[PDB]
Design a protein around this ligand. Structure first.
Ligand code: GDP
Ligand code: MG
Length: 217
């Protein structure tokens, strides 16, 4: 009935392009933004993210207002976090983005995480399972295992049936994950505060949610 996804990862990973592919729209910038698509009888909601996963987030988003906005847009919690990364370019910056995500949501959030690889065409027609299996990048290897081997490849220039197939594959994985959690979305003490304060006005809700995020990072 509803699937809430959040796109996370470094700047230039391909978050915005991936979101456009999923939504089938040219939808996706200092702020979090959102889009959605009605598929069958399911409402797929995608939150795209700005520069909030760098080592400079502390200077870019000092009172955690933008990190707070991400929570409000995804409340009561995501069914999956999509960690977007570029095929052949898993860098120190990608590793920094993963740590920011952990800091921002909690260690348990990797149990709701799917890794999306952009630039699929760089496999030159070869499979992703082989590429993931034979990479010399230890840190990528580790991350894939921490995310239960949930990996998926996108060519964000794909249109037509090639695009439908990559999106269908990703949504299948998200369903798999949701069933693993017996239908539960990810939650923590910040999402709970957002829900508790759901009757309050948007200004106090944002202020108090930003405040809870700041206390934990
Ligand atoms: N060739 C190719 N380019 C891509 C793909 N995905 C993203 N890009 C390009 O990578 C650049 C950064 O992507 P963007 O979505 O803006 O990254 P973001 O900062 O993570 O939102 C853009 O110029 C995209 O066109 C892909 O699958 N194939
Ligand atoms: Mg972007």
């Amino acid at each position: 009935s509803t699937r809430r996804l959040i796109l996370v990862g470094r700047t230039g990973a391909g978050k915005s392009a991936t979101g456009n592919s999923i939504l089938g729209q040219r939808r996706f910038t200092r702020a979090c933004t959102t889009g959605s698509r009605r598929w069958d009888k399911c409402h797929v909601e995608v939150v795209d993210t700005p520069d909030i996963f760098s080592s400079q987030v502390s200077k870019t988003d000092p009172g955690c207002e933008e990190r707070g906005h991400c929570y409000l847009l995804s409340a009561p919690g995501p069914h999956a976090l999509l960690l977007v990364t570029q095929l052949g370019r898993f860098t120190a910056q990608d590793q920094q983005a993963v740590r920011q995500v952990r800091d921002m949501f909690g260690e348990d959030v990797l149990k709701w995480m799917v890794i999306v690889f952009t630039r699929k065409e760089d496999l030159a027609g070869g499979s992703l399972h082989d590429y993931v299996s034979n990479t010399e990048n230890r840190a990528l290897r580790e991350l894939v295992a921490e995310c239960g081997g949930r990996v998926c490849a996108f060519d964000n220039r794909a249109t037509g049936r090639e695009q439908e197939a990559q999106v269908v594959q990703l949504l299948g994985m998200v369903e798999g994950l949701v069933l693993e959690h017996k239908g539960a979305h990810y939650s923590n003490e910040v999402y709970e505060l957002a829900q508790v304060l759901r009757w309050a006005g948007p200004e106090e809700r944002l202020r108090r949610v930003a405040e809870r995020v700041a206390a934990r990072v």
